Amino acid sequence: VFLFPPKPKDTLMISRTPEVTCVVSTDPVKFNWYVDVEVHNAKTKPREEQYNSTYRVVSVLTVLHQDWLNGKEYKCKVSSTIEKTISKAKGQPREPQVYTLPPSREEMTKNQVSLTCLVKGFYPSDIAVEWESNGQPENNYKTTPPVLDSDGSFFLYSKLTVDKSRWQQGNVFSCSVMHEALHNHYTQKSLSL
Amino acid sequence: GPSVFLFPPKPKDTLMISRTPEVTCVVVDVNSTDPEVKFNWYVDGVEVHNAKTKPREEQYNSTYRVVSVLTVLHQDWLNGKEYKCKVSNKALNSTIEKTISKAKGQPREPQVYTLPPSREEMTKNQVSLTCLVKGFYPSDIAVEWESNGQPENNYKTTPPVLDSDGSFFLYSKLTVDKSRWQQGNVFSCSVMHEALHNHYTQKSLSL
Ligand SMILES: *[C@@H]1O[C@H](CO)[C@@H](O[C@@H]2O[C@H](CO)[C@@H](O[C@@H]3O[C@H](CO[C@H]4O[C@H](CO)[C@@H](O)[C@H](O)[C@@H]4O[C@@H]4O[C@H](CO)[C@@H](O[C@@H]5O[C@H](CO)[C@H](O)[C@H](O)[C@H]5O)[C@H](O)[C@H]4NC(C)=O)[C@@H](O)[C@H](O[C@H]4O[C@H](CO)[C@@H](O)[C@H](O)[C@@H]4O)[C@@H]3O)[C@H](O)[C@H]2NC(C)=O)[C@H](O)[C@H]1NC(C)=O
Ligand SMILES: *[C@@H]1O[C@H](CO)[C@@H](O[C@@H]2O[C@H](CO)[C@@H](O[C@@H]3O[C@H](CO[C@H]4O[C@H](CO)[C@@H](O)[C@H](O)[C@@H]4O[C@@H]4O[C@H](CO)[C@@H](O[C@@H]5O[C@H](CO)[C@H](O)[C@H](O)[C@H]5O)[C@H](O)[C@H]4NC(C)=O)[C@@H](O)[C@H](O[C@H]4O[C@H](CO)[C@@H](O)[C@H](O)[C@@H]4O)[C@@H]3O)[C@H](O)[C@H]2NC(C)=O)[C@H](O)[C@H]1NC(C)=O
Ligand SMILES: *[C@@H]1O[C@H](CO[C@@H]2O[C@@H](C)[C@@H](O)[C@@H](O)[C@@H]2O)[C@@H](O[C@@H]2O[C@H](CO)[C@@H](O[C@@H]3O[C@H](CO[C@H]4O[C@H](CO)[C@@H](O)[C@H](O)[C@@H]4O)[C@@H](O)[C@H](O[C@H]4O[C@H](CO)[C@@H](O)[C@H](O)[C@@H]4O)[C@@H]3O)[C@H](O)[C@H]2NC(C)=O)[C@H](O)[C@H]1NC(C)=O
Numbered sequence: 001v002f003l004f005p006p007k008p009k010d011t012l013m014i015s016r017t018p019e020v021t022c023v024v025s026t027d028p029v030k031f032n033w034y035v036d037v038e039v040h041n042a043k044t045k046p047r048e049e050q051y052n053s054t055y056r057v058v059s060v061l062t063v064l065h066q067d068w069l070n071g072k073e074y075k076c077k078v079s080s081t082i083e084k085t086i087s088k089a090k091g092q093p094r095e096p097q098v099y100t101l102p103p104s105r106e107e108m109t110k111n112q113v114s115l116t117c118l119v120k121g122f123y124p125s126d127i128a129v130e131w132e133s134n135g136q137p138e139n140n141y142k143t144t145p146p147v148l149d150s151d152g153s154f155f156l157y158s159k160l161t162v163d164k165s166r167w168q169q170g171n172v173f174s175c176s177v178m179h180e181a182l183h184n185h186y187t188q189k190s191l192s193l
Numbered sequence: 194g195p196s197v198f199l200f201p202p203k204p205k206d207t208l209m210i211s212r213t214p215e216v217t218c219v220v221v222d223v224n225s226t227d228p229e230v231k232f233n234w235y236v237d238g239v240e241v242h243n244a245k246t247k248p249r250e251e252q253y254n255s256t257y258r259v260v261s262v263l264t265v266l267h268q269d270w271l272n273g274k275e276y277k278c279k280v281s282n283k284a285l286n287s288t289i290e291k292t293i294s295k296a297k298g299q300p301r302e303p304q305v306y307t308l309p310p311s312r313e314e315m316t317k318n319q320v321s322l323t324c325l326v327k328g329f330y331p332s333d334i335a336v337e338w339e340s341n342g343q344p345e346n347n348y349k350t351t352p353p354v355l356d357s358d359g360s361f362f363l364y365s366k367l368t369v370d371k372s373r374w375q376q377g378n379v380f381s382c383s384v385m386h387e388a389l390h391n392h393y394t395q396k397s398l399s400l
C-alpha cells in the first residue's frame with residue numbers, strides 16, 4: 001500500500017481537480033477512505049498485473065482544494081487491514097521569490113542557450129513551474145526537484161532551452177510559478193535579451 | 194530471510210588518484226542464532242580476495258549486520274568493471290548477491306556556466322550565485338564553491354537531472370552577503386567529473 005499526494009497545479013486552481021492516489025496473485029481488495037471519518041467517493045481501477053505476476057489495484061480519492069490545503073489528513077484502508085496516511089506538509093507557507101537569469105556569455109557560442117528560472121524561499125515544496133513565450137507554452141524545459149535550503153525553505157531551478165537565434169532576436173520568455181503562498185497562486189517573470 | 198545492499202564509491206573518490214574509492218556490501222537481517230556469514234567478491238565475474246570484512250555487529254532489532262568493503266582501482270571503476278558481492282549463510286545453504294558498476298553509456302563533458310544574481314535579488318541582504326553544470330554523462334559528479342582560495346560552504350546543489358538529450362544537468366546555488374558580492378570578490382565554482390580534463394574544471398564569478 002502506497003499513498004501519493006495530488007499534483008501541485010491541481011490544488012492551486014479551483015478549475016483543476018486534485019486527487020489522492022492509493023496504489024497497491026491468486027485471490028485479490030476493499031478500499032476504505034477516511035479523511036481525519038469515512039468517505040465513499042473514491043473510484044478504483046481494476047487489477048492490472050506486471051512482469052512478476054502480482055496485481056496492482058489503484059484507487060483514487062477526489063479531494064477538496066481547501067481540505068488538502070488546510071492540512072486535513074487522508075487515510076487509505078486496504079484490506080486483516082493495512083493503513084497509510086498523507087497530508088500536506090505542516091507549516092506557515094512562505095512566498096517564493098522568482099528570478100529569471102539570462103544565459104552565460106560563455107554559453108552564447110553554443111547554438112542553443114539556457115534561460116534559467118531560479119525559484120527561492122518557498123514552503124512547502126509543492127510547486128509548479130512552466131515556460132511561455134507569446135502566450136504559447138514552451139516544450140523544451142526541465143525543472144529540478146525542490147532542494148531543501150539551509151533555512152528550512154526550498155528552492156529549485158528551471159532551465160528552458162532555445163535556439164540562440166530566438167534569444168538573440170529579442171523574443172520574450174516567461175517563467176510561470178504556481179505555489180499556494182503566491183497571490184492568486186501564480187506569478188510570472190519574463191526574460192529577454 | 195536476510196537482505197544485501199551494495200554501495201558505489203563516491204564520485205570524488207574515483208576521480209583523484211590520491212583518494213580511495215571503495216565498494217561497500219552490507220548484509221542486514223542476519224538471524225541471531227548461528228550468524229556465521231561469508232562474503233565472496235567478483236570483478237567482471239572473476240573472484241578477488243582483497244576485501245576487508247568487519248566483525249558482525251548486533252543491531253537493536255534482534256538481527257545482525259555485516260559489512261564488507263572492497264577497495265577499487267580508480268580506472269577499473271571508470272572503465273565500467275562490474276563488482277559482485279555474494280553473501281552466503283552457513284546454516285541455510287542459500288546465498289544473496291548484488292551487482293554494482295558505473296552507469297553504462299558514452300561519457301559526456303559537462304559545460305559549466307556561472308550566472309550572477311538577478312537585479313531584483315539585489316534588493317536583499319543575501320544574493321544567490323548560480324553555477325549551471327549541464328550536458329554531462331554519467332551523472333556522478335562533485336561540485337564545490339571557493340572564494341579567494343578558501344572553501345565557501347553556504348551552498349546547496351541539486352540532484353543531477355536528466356535532460357532531453359540523454360545528458361544530465363544540475364545547478365548549484367551559493368548564498369552570500371550582498372556586501373561581499375558588491376565589494377567585488379571573485380567566487381569560484383568547482384566541478385569534478387570523469388569527462389573533464391584532469392577530472393576537474395573551475396569557473397569564477399564576480400560583480
Ligand atoms: C511486482 O512488480 C510491481 C511493478 O514493478 C511492483 O510494484 C512496485 O512496488 C514497489 C514496492 O515494493 C514500489 O516502490 C515504491 O515506489 C514509491 C514511489 O512510487 C512512485 O514512483 C515510482 C518510481 O520510483 C513509480 O513507479 C510509482 O508508480 C510512483 O509514481 C507516482 O505514482 C503516483 C500514483 O498514481 C502518481 O501520482 C498521481 O498522479 C495522478 C496523475 O497521474 C494524479 O495527479 C494524482 O493526484 C497523483 O497522486 C505519480 O504521477 C507517479 N509519479 C511518477 C514519477 O512515477 C517509493 O516512494 C516507495 O518508497 C517507500 O519506501 C522507501 C524505502 O526506502 C522510502 O524511501 C519511501 O519514503 C516510501 O516509504 C517504494 O520505493 C513501486 O513503485 C511499484 N511500482 C509501480 C507502482 O509501478 C510490485 O511490488 C511487485 N510485487 C510485489 C509483491 O511487491
Ligand atoms: C534491523 O536493523 C537493521 C539495521 O539498520 C535494518 O537495516 C536497514 O535495512 C534497510 C532496508 O532493510 C536498509 O535500507 C536501504 O538503505 C539504502 C541506503 O542506505 C544508506 O543510507 C542510509 C541513510 O538513509 C543508511 O541508514 C544506510 O546505512 C546506508 O548508508 C550508506 O552506507 C554505505 C555503506 O557503508 C555508504 O557507502 C560508503 O560510504 C563510505 C563513507 O561512509 C565511502 O564513501 C564508500 O566509498 C561507500 O561505499 C553510504 O555513504 C551510506 N549512505 C548514506 C546516505 O549515508 C537504500 O538505498 C535502499 O533502497 C533499496 O530499496 C529502495 C526501495 O525501497 C530501492 O529504490 C533501492 O534501489 C534499494 O533497492 C534501502 O532502503 C538500510 O540500509 C539498513 N540499515 C543499515 C544501517 O544497514 C534492518 O532493516 C532491520 N530489520 C528489521 C526486520 O527490522
Ligand atoms: C532464527 O533461526 C532459528 C533456527 O532456525 C532453525 O534452524 C535453521 C538452520 C533453519 O533450518 C530453520 O528453518 C530452522 O527453523 C529459528 O528457530 C526455530 O524457529 C521455528 C519457528 O520459528 C521453530 O519451529 C517450531 O518449533 C516448535 C517447537 O517444537 C518443539 O516442541 C514440540 C512440543 O510442543 C516437540 O514435540 C517438537 O518435536 C519440538 O521439539 C513447534 O511446536 C512448531 O510447530 C508449530 O507449527 C506447526 C505447523 O508449522 C504445527 O503443526 C504445530 O502444531 C505447532 O503449532 C514449529 O515447528 C524451531 O523449533 C526453532 N528452532 C530453533 C533451534 O531455534 C528462529 O525462528 C529464527 N528467528 C528468526 C527471527 O527468523
Ligand SMILES: *[C@@H]1O[C@H](CO)[C@@H](O)[C@H](O)[C@H]1NC(C)=O
Pocket residue numbers: 286287
Ligand atoms: C549449496 O547449493 C549449491 C547450489 O545448489 C551447491 O553447489 C553447493 O554444493 C551447496 N552446498 C553444499 C555444502 O553442498
